[PDB]
C-alpha cells in the first residue's frame with residue numbers, strides 16, 4: 001500500500017530553495033491526521049474560509065475572530081508563513097456592506113447623488129473592515145490577498161472588470177481603496193496581492209495585466225499576483241502558465257500559486273466517478289504526469305514564484321467534491337491532491353518529490 005504522508009520526505013523540504021509549500025485549512029484540520037500531514041509537509045498556511053469577509057464581520061461592527069485566531073496561533077506555534085485570504089470578495093461577504101442607510105440595496109438606487117453617497121459609505125465600511133482586520137493580524141501575515149476575483153472572465157466593460165456589487169457601487173475605486181488601506185495599516189513591507197483564477201487564459205489574463213499596470217502607474221501599492229490554479233489534467237497548458245507568470249514578473253510583481261488543485265474532470269464535470277474507489281488507477285497516473293510537469297515548471301520559474309499553496313490537504317476534503325456532486329445529481333468524487341483520503345501518498349507525490 002502507499003505509505004502515510006508523514007512517512008515520506010517533506011514537500012516543503014524538497015522545495016525549500018524555490019518557494020513555500022502551503023495548504024488551505026479549517027480549524028478542525030489543525031489536529032488529528034490532517035494536522036499531522038500539515039505539520040510534516042507545509043511551511044505556509046491560508047484559511048480556506050475563516051478569513052473571508054463574512055467570517056470576520058458578519059454584522060456591522062460585530063467581529064468574530066475565533067476561527068481565524070486559531071489558524072494564526074497554529075502558524076505561530078509551528079513557524080509557518082501565513083497568507084491572508086481575503087480582504088475583498090463578492091462571495092462569502094455579508095450583505096450589510098451593500099445596503100444604504102434606509103436598509104435597501106445600494107445597487108437599486110437610481111438617483112446619481114445618492115449613488116455617490118452610497119459609494120462613499122461602502123468605501124468607508126470597506127476601510128473600517130480592512131483597518132480592523134489588518135491591525136489584528138499585521139505581525140503574522142506574510143502575503144495579503146487584498147482583493148479576490150475582481151477581473152471578469154469576459155468583457156462586460158472596457159476594462160474587463162467583474163461587475164459585482166463592488167464595481168456597480170464604486171467602479172474600480174474599491175480596489176484602489178483596498179490596497180491603499182492595506183498598505184497604510186499593514187506597513188511598508190507587507191506583501192499585497194491581487195488574487196484570481198484563470199489568470200493563464202485570455203481575455204482574463206490580459207484584463208488583469210492591464211489592471212495591475214494601470215493601478216501601479218497610479219501609485220496604488222500592489223506587490224504580487226495570486227494565481228488560484230484551479231486547474232485540470234490537460235488544461236491550461238504549461239506554456240500558458242509560464243507566459244502568465246513571466247508577464248507579471250516583467251512588471252516587477254511577485255507570483256504566488258494560491259489555491260492549487262488538479263481536478264480529475266474537465267467542464268462540465270460529468271460523468272464523475274461516483275466514489276473514490278471507482279476512480280481507475282490510470283486517472284491517478286495521468287494526474288501524476290500533470291503534477292510532475294507543473295512542479296518542473298514552478299521550479300524553472302522559482303526566481304519569480306515565492307509560494308505554492310494547495311487548496312486543501314488530502315483528498316477527503318475539497319470543494320471539488322461539491323462541484324462534482326452539483327453536476328452529477330448529488331453523487332461524485334474528485335481527488336485533486338498528492339495525498340489520498342486516508343493520508344496515503346498518491347502517484348503524484350512521488351513525481352513531485354523526485
Ligand SMILES: [Mg+2]
Pocket residue numbers: 292350351352353354
Ligand atoms: Mg518529478
Ligand code: NA
Pocket residue numbers: 017018019301302303304305306307
Ligand atoms: Na522563489
